[PDB]
Structure 1
Amino acid sequence: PLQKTYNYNVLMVPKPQGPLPNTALLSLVLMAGTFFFAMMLRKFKNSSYFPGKLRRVIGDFGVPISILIMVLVDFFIQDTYTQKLSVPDGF
């Protein structure tokens, strides 16, 4: 939640205990940014702005480009926490 003060001697190895300062808003901004980028690339695919070959090539890769750009944006931020993907170790 959005509170006035947080505790900062919290152990986060298994999972975030207690509220965190900037997680909820970074999550909301990242989701909205990914959606907005997806919609603009979907609309650019059908536009008439570049040569047809390069335009269609860029428009067909809209979702992977937005995902890679967005994830890199999250990778550049160091101190802020964001929930990640986790898979089992082995078969």
Structure 2
Amino acid sequence: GVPISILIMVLVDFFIQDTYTQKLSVPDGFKVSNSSARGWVIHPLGLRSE
């Protein structure tokens, strides 16, 4: 029932081209959220300061 409710309604806003509705936004790739702050493995004694 839920997958059909979403399919029926996803189509309703798809075929309505002009109006704007917020869609799901996902990150570009498998990367950390801030490359200027931290990496993938994080040191227990600190990044910049002890």
Aligned residues: 30
Q: Which amino acid aligns with 1:73?
A: V
Instruction: Tell me the distance in 1 between the aligned counterparts of 2:11 and 2:24.
Output: 15
Listed as ranges, the gaps of 5+ residues in structure 2 are 31-50
User: Where does structure 1 differ by over 3 angstroms across 4 or more consecutive aligned residues?
Assistant: none
Of 25, 44, 49, which residue of structure 2 is paired with 1:86? 25
Give the TM-score taking structure 2 as reference length.
0.58
Aligned residue for 1:66, secondary structure, equals helix
Per residue, is there more helix in 1 or in 2? 1
Same amino acid, percent of matched pairs: 100
Listed as ranges, the gaps of 5+ residues in structure 1 are 1-61
Q: What is the match of residue 67 of structure 1?
A: 6
Structure with greater contact order relative to length (CA < 8 Å, sep ≥ 6): 1
Q: Deviations over 1:11-59 (max 9, x none)?
A: xxxxxxxxxxxxxxxxxxxxxxxxxxxxxxxxxxxxxxxxxxxxxxxxx
Q: Which amino acid aligns with 2:19?
A: T
